[PDB]
Amino acid sequence: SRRYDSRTTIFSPEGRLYQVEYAMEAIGHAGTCLGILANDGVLLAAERRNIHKLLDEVFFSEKIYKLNEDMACSVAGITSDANVLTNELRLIAQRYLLQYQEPIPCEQLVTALCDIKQAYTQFGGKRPFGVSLLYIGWDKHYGFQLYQSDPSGNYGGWKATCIGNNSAAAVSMLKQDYKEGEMTLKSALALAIKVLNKTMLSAEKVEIATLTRENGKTVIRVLKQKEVEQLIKKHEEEEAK
Amino acid sequence: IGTGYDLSASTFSPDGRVFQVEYAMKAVENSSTAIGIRCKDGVVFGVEKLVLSKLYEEGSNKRLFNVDRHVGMAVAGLLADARSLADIAREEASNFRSNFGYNIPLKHLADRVAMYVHAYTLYSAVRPFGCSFMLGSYSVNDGAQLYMIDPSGVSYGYWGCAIGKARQAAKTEIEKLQMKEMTCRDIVKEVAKIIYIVHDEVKDKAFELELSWVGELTNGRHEIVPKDIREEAEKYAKESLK
Amino acid sequence: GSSAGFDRHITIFSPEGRLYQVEYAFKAINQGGLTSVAVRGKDCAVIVTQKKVPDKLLDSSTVTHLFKITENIGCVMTGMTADSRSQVQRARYEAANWKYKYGYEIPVDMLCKRIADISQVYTQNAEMRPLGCCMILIGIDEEQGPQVYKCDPAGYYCGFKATAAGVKQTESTSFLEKKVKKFDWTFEQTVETAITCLSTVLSIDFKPSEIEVGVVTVENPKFRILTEAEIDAHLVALAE
Amino acid sequence: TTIAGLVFQDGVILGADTRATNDSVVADKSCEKIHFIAPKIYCCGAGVAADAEMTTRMVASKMELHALSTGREPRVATVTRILRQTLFRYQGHVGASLIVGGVDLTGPQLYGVHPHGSYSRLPFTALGSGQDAALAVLEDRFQPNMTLEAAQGLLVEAVTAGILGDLGSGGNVDACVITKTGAKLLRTLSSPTEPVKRSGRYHFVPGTTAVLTQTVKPL
Amino acid sequence: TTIMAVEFDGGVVMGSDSRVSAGEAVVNRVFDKLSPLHERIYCALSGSAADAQAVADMAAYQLELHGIELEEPPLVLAAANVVRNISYKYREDLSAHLMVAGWDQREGGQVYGTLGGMLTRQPFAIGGSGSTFIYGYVDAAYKPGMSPEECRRFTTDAIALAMSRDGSSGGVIYLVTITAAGVDHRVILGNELPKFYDE
Amino acid sequence: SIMSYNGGAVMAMKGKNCVAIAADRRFGIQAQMVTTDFQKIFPMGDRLYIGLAGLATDVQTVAQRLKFRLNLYELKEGRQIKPYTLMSMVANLLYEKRFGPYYTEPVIAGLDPKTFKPFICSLDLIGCPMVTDDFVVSGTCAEQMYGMCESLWEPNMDPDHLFETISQAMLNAVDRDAVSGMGVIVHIIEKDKITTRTLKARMD
Amino acid sequence: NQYDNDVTVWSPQGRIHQIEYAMEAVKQGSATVGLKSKTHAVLVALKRAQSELAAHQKKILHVDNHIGISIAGLTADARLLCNFMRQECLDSRFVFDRPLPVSRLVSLIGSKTQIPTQRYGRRPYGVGLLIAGYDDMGPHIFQTCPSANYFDCRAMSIGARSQSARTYLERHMSEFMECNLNELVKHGLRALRETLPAEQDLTTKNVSIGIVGKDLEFTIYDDDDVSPFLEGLEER
Amino acid sequence: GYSFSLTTFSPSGKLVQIEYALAAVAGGAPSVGIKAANGVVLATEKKQKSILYDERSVHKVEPITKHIGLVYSGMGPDYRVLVHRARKLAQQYYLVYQEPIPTAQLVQRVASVMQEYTQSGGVRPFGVSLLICGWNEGRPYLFQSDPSGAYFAWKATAMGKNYVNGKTFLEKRYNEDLELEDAIHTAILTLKESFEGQMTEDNIEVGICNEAGFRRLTPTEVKDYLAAI
Ligand SMILES: *[B]([O])([O])[C]([C]C1=[C][C]=[C]C([C][C])=[C]1)[N]C(=O)[C]([C]C1=[C][C]=[C][C]=[C]1)[N]C(=O)C1=N[C]=[C]N=[C]1
Ligand SMILES: *[B]([O])([O])[C]([C]C1=[C][C]=[C]C([C][C])=[C]1)[N]C(=O)[C]([C]C1=[C][C]=[C][C]=[C]1)[N]C(=O)C1=N[C]=[C]N=[C]1
Ligand code: NA
């Protein structure tokens, strides 16, 4: 028994949690997934890895998950692990709603899942969840929000961020073209395609979703392939000129 | 085969063996010899109980036990394991009477206890018993019955049986006896003779002979062989050696 | 045939997707030294195995590999004897439990599927080892006629026209397929096929105490174990 | 409720009324008391309607798992046992009184299962508040090996006697015939009460109801 | 209900009426209360129908596995202890009496009482609501050394005598004769019952 | 009775291609009225509503525990629930408390996703589903409601006819119930729209 | 090498090295001697001091009015075993209102201490005891070990240099049954002093005595209470 | 039991036990699923080692409920565990919602159990990849669930021995507008691409799903499909 134990919840000589660090490597191999905050909304733009000709495409998305009436998320890592976490996110959002009769504020939903992810690093002897998440949302306290959380259970709020393949290159590219406070969903969608083009471009290989506020109610919408095509050719035109 | 394949009972070796059980069987083979003989009117047990120290009392470390009023147990191997099996066997017999209102049939007791033994041969969590033992019984309905269980959990019925250092040597001597037509009074003298023959006076120190029997003579009750009959069998055993 | 980590010590996949510990449990069956044959006929099913009693010091009637699971279901176990007894106790439990919950006797296939499913758990959980034994069950089905089923330490199970287990399993199956290819499958033709398979494969001209025969018949579905005199009546007719 | 069973020459007939009562008030004029267990096993429920509904649903679901695993048609003994052992465990607190009828490899069978978990294999039976009216018709005219037409006729009469004699029973007679070849669910096989007619002139002119608030949500 | 068992040389005779009631209402008028616990071991059921059937189902199950483990037909004493223990452990929650009778290679034909978790061997025994009115009859009519036919006649007469007097008893008398050879099932119809003073 | 501690009434009615759902607005404890605007009908979809009569805590609790399961269901399923399926969801929620139940008797009124077929039903306090093709009632004035509904209901009622019928059946029933009233609210659920109306009702 | 780590691992020789390692704890505790006559059971033990300033450790503990023990090994395991024994004794007097028969108590120790020798992650007791008792079978001297085996003894010695003490008990064995209390205790003291170095003798500071018998309940003598017995010793 | 995970992340970021479980699948007998316009086909190689095997005794194509069916590649005994679990899960849904479980819903529930065996302590992942077919909301469904617990909705796909070739063969050979009568023929031709020997109605197994639910084709039905091949 001691022989077969992997020791997944222990520190290395330099104060490192190796399973947590190896979980992150898994996320680097997953498809690129970026989030951009704007004044009139917030978006999620991810690379599609289920890109074979004989796929049925039954669901409305591949990587984009609705969690709440006001929140959505995207994943990068082990997709089965991500199914567990998104399902738990939906249960946490309903436990809050049942109790307070108001939707869960964005940061609180992220912290709650991150406390489950952290527990996998400190006790139990199990491997961690090999997933990183990008959360988009709206709440009555901080309005449009964009979060990111990694397998360690650590999280942060962002104005633009990227996870998955070539995440590093995309964050340096977003760092240059992001105009804090002067961004709109129209300009941010242009930036989302501009970034994914370099870090990877058919509307079959991409998947975009937006979160906006229409008539005092939140509107979450995954863009249609034609919509994505019109956004790609509006950039293809600017690249040639 | 010292390559990890022999550290757990939940691990088979590449040739399909469970070495933890084989190493537990070795603990019995290293121990002193115990013999049991089934005859026309009962079952008789005899044990070569080596005297480790002159300081110990006569009758210390009794390798013969009463598992039930009609059942007896002869052990060879790691004594604390052997006594723990005696308590299991006892409780098994006790639970049969509480369930069905009559004495546990010997093959049934052998079957039940052999599976508590078997259970310890499947996991990394527990260790096999380093013990082999015999169960003897006599009733009018079932007749004379002798069974033996090994560390692997195997239970077989016997006419004659030996366990320990001299298991094979005692077997070629029990084979000379025509026990199927003998009494327990007759077979007692022979059990002592066989134990004295297979004893190693050079390699081993002094020994004490333990003799027990269950048969028609005892009214189906497992008893120690009285001092009177034991002295008579030990006298014949020594006289035969010369 | 690569190894990585503890794939030869516990039931975890090897680089090729194999379960070395399960493979070793099949080799444990042969450690017993015996071989077993089972043949299904037009209206019967017979199981026959070796009966090696080396010392006259044993009580020959307690040395057996044939077992009664239920009144109409019997089995021949091949492999590690205590592992085999363990599986027979569980088979008996599962069968009695089935009739208690469902009010009808367990079908041969359902008892086989059940024991095979129990065996699979050992194949997936690491803290315990597979059983080093093979179970072959026979019985007469109310609407399916005579049944012969076998289950593995792997958890696999199946129905058969004829089957074998143990040391000379491959040769016994090679022989059994040659006879089924070419007969009116009567009780005598089913019994003899099984006896002469064990005999020609082990190259032993049997004595009535050297083998044990078990049978289920459509006329008498109760699992019956053959006497030495009954075993001899077949052995002598085979020599004729 | 008036639920009834019969065993004829080629199978079983199950009968039921369509009244659900909530304390001397008829809540439902046409409920379904004959429930499916397996293709050739049906069950009539009487008592606490939720208990009859859920214990029938649970055993039907358990019989699908049974048949899927075995690969065979389920036996009526299995449904009787699964039901009894569940009801006994609840000690009569699950108030379902059932009439299980069906056909398996061992022929047609009819069983009465009571809320405490007791059962009987019967050639004819009746349960519910109107069981005595049905049991009188069955005792009076049951003969073994009845023809399908003769058995249907007797069953309809047995349920009808309960419909008119029991205040806790009414509506139509629902029936189910189960034979070696399957089951025919004869809903509203008989209607002992001819279509109820009124001279209803209860029309309200639009605007007669005084409205204080009005909001319209387009969809 | 009226149940009865009688020991004889080669075995036992067990009888019962056929009435299942629910208050003053006869629910089943042809119930067989002699339930087999093994080939050659039977029990006669009385009291709560649900409790009696539950105990019989569990006892037959326990005895089936017990028999297969001993590679032998269970002893009637073992079957009596099996029923008795269940009736005793659950005596506060059970309201059934299961009389146990049958045959053995060892002790031949034996009759047992299980009333409220107790255990008693009887040359003959009676149970159920109907037994109250035939105590004086069985005390006068029982003679030792009765043949199996004489046992069936003693059982039929005593049960018919109780059936007439007891509202909770009636219908038909089911007879069962357990012997080394096997079990015989008889049914005495309500038309064929023995006649005595009934006014 | 426990159900009469708070009082109230709920009713649902079928239409040719529309459905109606109505309830009173009293919230009172025993003989004392607390508020005159208590909500007893809750939207479960675009064209699906549930009305709960009985003990005010359990009306609120059942509605909230049902909305929890509903939201999770629509998230996993990616579709709006069918009216019949919502009934089965309430039956299972109520039956879970079989031996210690919620004191509420629901009524469901909605339209089939085939954007048409009206659906009405009711459940007892232990979750027994009951679908009808006419009307369903639940309240302290169920006897009054049955009388009004049985007399007033007609088969293929137009939305306007349905409105007058359900309004008159609620008003006249709750006007003979001491612990029901303080106004009536009615929802008319058509394919194209929902019309919510509060009636001018007695205030005693 | 690999067969040293856990008690559940059998070595290829049919040995359990963890049990053997636990027995090394007993051999490293200071010498204790137990012996019996026809009426008495005596426990005589040497008490080591961890420095001149520290006191000589309590080697003899009370179990019941008819039972007393002397320990050798892990003192924390000795306390664990002592409280189990004290409690088993309490249960017997509570239930039966009679002393727990000494041989029965010793069987419970063997049964209790065998359990962790067959369970993974568990370890045997690192304690060996000498038990002095009196019951309907007269006086008794028992020996328990980290291997769950136990022995009925006429006399015995466990611990550091206990071989020297064993030799005196074997040579004087015959005189013990007819011995009076003063003589039986002196025999115990002589066996104890044979383990002691050549330069070292017995002392009213390092000697501890425990006596139980026909009229005496288990009593522990330690310093000036030990003086009357030492006042008879005369040589080597 | 063993409370620690047996599947952990290698330094390169791979869950190697899941990779090794996928190897067990890639070495199993081939299976095919084809989503036709009016139905779904499931086809597999049921070739056993000798004539002595009673082919009719055990099945690879299995029903879950009236409208859902199943097939696999990999470890046979592992599959049986998932079949029982799937049938149970389908009854739990029906008991609550009183509606046949949607195929996406069954596939999701089953895939959750598969994920569990990649993280729960002292167990290895399943050495099986399942092809699940169903009929709900008047339309056909074809899904695949692999040892990691990941699911995929396919129009047509292959698993087991020679799946790379079968998957290219399916892509080019047929496309949308397939009648179920045409799809069965294609599934058997995809299998004939790997099969070693004469392909009979006793060594291949087919199952169909349509408006009438899911059912396994009889050997006489398979024989008539093989009469045209
Ligand atoms: B019957 O009259 O006994 C009836 C049985 C019933 C009713 C509806 C649906 C089914 C399907 C299995 C069965 N039971 C009732 O009417 C009961 C009240 C009752 C109880 C005992 C004796 C007589 C009547 N009513 C309900 O439980 C109920 N009524 C309306 C709506 N939901 C439940
Ligand atoms: B008898 O009168 O004691 C009879 C015996 C019995 C035992 C097992 C099985 C059955 C039939 C399934 C019957 N029991 C009854 O008739 C009892 C009522 C009784 C009990 C004691 C004295 C007089 C009468 N029946 C029931 O408990 C019962 N039967 C049907 C419906 N509900 C309950
Ligand atoms: Na394992």
Side-chain angles (χ1 to χ4, degrees), chain C residues 11 121-130:
Chain C
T11 55
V121 181
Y122 312 153
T123 274
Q124 188 153 27
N125 291 49
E127 76 266 19
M128 88 286 296
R129 62 161 180 87

Side-chain angles (χ1 to χ4, degrees), chain A residues 41-59:
Chain A
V42 54
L43 71 108
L44 269 169
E47 160 193 355
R48 268 204 174 106
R49 288 281 196 175
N50 287 1
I51 49 173
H52 185 273
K53 289 195 180 180
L54 298 180
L55 289 174
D56 201 6
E57 287 193 25
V58 179
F59 312 90

Side-chain angles (χ1 to χ4, degrees), chain D residues 162-178:
Chain D
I163 284 185
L164 310 134
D166 176 38
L167 303 170
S169 298
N172 316 289
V173 173
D174 288 348
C176 185
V177 176
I178 314 170

Side-chain angles (χ1 to χ4, degrees), chain F residues 15-83:
Chain F
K16 180 189 304 178
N17 282 297
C18 57
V19 68
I21 190 148
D24 71 319
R25 291 156 59 76
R26 201 188 104 109
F27 169 53
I29 288 141
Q30 285 182 332
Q32 165 167 146
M33 183 267 306
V34 172
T35 72
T36 202
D37 61 327
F38 199 71
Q39 190 189 359
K40 299 157 181 230
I41 303 160
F42 310 91
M44 303 288 290
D46 287 358
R47 303 155 186 87
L48 182 61
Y49 286 75
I50 184 169
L52 302 104
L55 207 57
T57 294
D58 295 341
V59 162
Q60 302 187 315
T61 286
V62 164
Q64 299 173 331
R65 298 223 198 247
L66 188 63
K67 198 64 166 90
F68 179 113
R69 300 187 181 191
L70 177 69
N71 292 159
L72 295 179
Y73 173 80
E74 300 184 334
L75 279 169
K76 298 186 189 177
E77 290 255 0
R79 71 180 160 165
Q80 225 172 121
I81 193 152
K82 288 179 179 59

